[model samples]
Target: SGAIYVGNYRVVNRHLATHNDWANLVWEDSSRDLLVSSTTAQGCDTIARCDCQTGVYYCSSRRKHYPVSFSKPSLIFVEASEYYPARYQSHLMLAVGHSEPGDCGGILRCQHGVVGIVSTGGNGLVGFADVRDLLWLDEE
Candidate 1:
């Protein structure tokens, strides 16, 4: 088994993934009042970044964007991780979609390099795939 820390936060859980590979996980950190993620598998890919404040937590990829929010203060922290199966292709990433009162949205899995908007909310699954390049919006 492996260990994945939440940076300044406490340790959550860990798992083992066969076949050397890397994945990008995204989530909102309530304790820190920011959005953070970690990349792992091998190499120096493990990292964390603050997206924005909890009230302004936002996530986006491709041409789609999502405003992060929690129905409960206890559900403020969002965490997700993934491990692709052997010989798998296309996409291999998972993330926490949304957090609600005493409940959480199912894991959003990437398919063919795309992660549809899978949520327990009224909004149905939205399509967001076709990986080619990534551009981060940094305002300072």
Candidate 2:
């Protein structure tokens, strides 16, 4: 790895699981691993390990029933918009690709499932439908 330049970066405690040969590795998927609470619906805190052999990154989350895998993938958007409770209809988002949180997270790749949290209103939505229909729409 080489030194990268960024305006700012945050360091979080991560648990890394590497292979004996140092060629293979895996880690927990923090994005899909949501924290469901009455106070908060979901928390998208995730991290992934890069695997060169499989051409995909793997991640696991405590929220999931079993181990889950993911890779960089593309998202095709049909239509999207954001409303601010009659305050404004300012930002209209048409399409966006989904990915993890790290540098290599959103990059294109196959075999690995793309995971991340969509930043919507204040609360978090579970599925795509919930996000698109409920949180992002205005009845009027």
Candidate 3:
């Protein structure tokens, strides 16, 4: 019934430039979709959606690094709020294994576990959750 926030690991030990560029989310009802945005990937970040009930994430293969692989699993929690649709945004505290240096690979939550590997494009932020798992993160 309420919003949920997940992922808030130690960013300092990971050697990350900043801890703010974790993850963000937005929602659009007319579109019947929830937009999961991140502060990585050349600042453009990435977006993925999941069905409200199915919890299956749908995303594009755009701006991804080549040679994809997954060995770790990450947890993502999303929820909606009615405080102010004006400043809607989702922030992610990427874990040490999810997004790290040299491990420029993307993050995806697979059926078995989590996968992380370089995409076709370079390294940045990656989405690996279903849309349904994501409720809302948009600014009306």
| Clashing residue pairs for model 1 | 114-129, 117-126
Model 3 per-residue lDDT tens digits across residues 1-140: 01112232111111122234233422222121122223332321122332111121113333333333321223433232222122222222222122222332233433422221221111344322222233232211
**Candidate 2, after superposition: displacement of residue 41 in Å?**
27
lDDT of candidate 1 over 49-106, digit per residue (tens):
3221122111332222344332211221123313212222121122334322112112
Tell me the whole-model lDDT of each prediction, alpha carbons only: 0.23, 0.20, 0.25
Clashes counted in candidate 2 amount to 11
Off by over 4 Å in 3: 1-46, 51-64, 67-100, 104-132
Candidate with top lDDT is: 3
The digit string of per-residue lDDT tens for model 2 on 12-121 reads 11212123212321222232211111211232322222331222222122122212232233232222323112222111111122212221111112243222222222
| TM-score: model 2 vs. ground truth | 0.18
Residue 93 local lDDT, model 1: 22
Cα deviation at 105, candidate 2, in Å, is: 15
What is candidate 1's TM-score against the reference? 0.18
Judging by TM-score against the true structure, name the best candidate.
3
Candidates 1 and 3 compared: the better one by TM-score is 3
